[PDB]
Homo-oligomer: A and B are copies of this chain.
Amino acid sequence: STARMQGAGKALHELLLSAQRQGCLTAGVYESAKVLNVDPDNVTFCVLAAGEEDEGDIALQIHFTLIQAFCCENDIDIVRVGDVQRLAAIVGAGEEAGAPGDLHCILISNPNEDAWKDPALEKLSLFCEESRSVNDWVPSITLPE
C-alpha cells in the first residue's frame, strides 16, 4: 500500500487513542447525532464504519448519507473504515461495558474551543484534502493491524 495510505492508518489509529484518552471521542450514531445537534462547532473528524454484517441495513445507510451531508457542508473531515473488529479493538481501550454497542459512527472533538494542533489530525486533514481532489469525499483508511 502507498506511503500515504500507511501513514493514514497510523494517523487515524493514533488519533483514536489520543482522543479516547482525552475524552473527546464520541461513539455511535445516536451519540454522534446528539453532538452534531448540541456542539457541532467543536467536531474535528468523523469516521463511519460498517461491515458485511451491516449490508441490507437501510436506516443505517440513510444515517451515513445524512452524516456525510453534514460533515461535508461543515468542512468536517470524514473517512470510512471497513474493518469493524479492528476498530472495536482500538476504540475498545477503556473498561468496556461489554463492547461499544455501536461503532458505526465516531466523532472526535477538540478538548478546547480553539484549534487542536494534533499532528495525526493534521496528517489526516491533508489525506482527506487529497482524496477530496479526486472527488472521493468519504475515503477509506486501512487501520494498521
Contacts and interface: CB of A to CB of B under 8 A. Distances in A.
Interface residues of A, number: 20
Given A33-B66, A62-B33, A63-B66, A73 B74 contact: yes
A101 to B, nearest CB: 13
B40 A73 contact: yes
A17 interface: no
Interface in A1-51: 29-30, 33-34, 36-37, 40
A69 interface: yes
Interface string A71-103: 011100000000000000000000000000000
Contact of A29 (B33, B62, B68, B74): B62
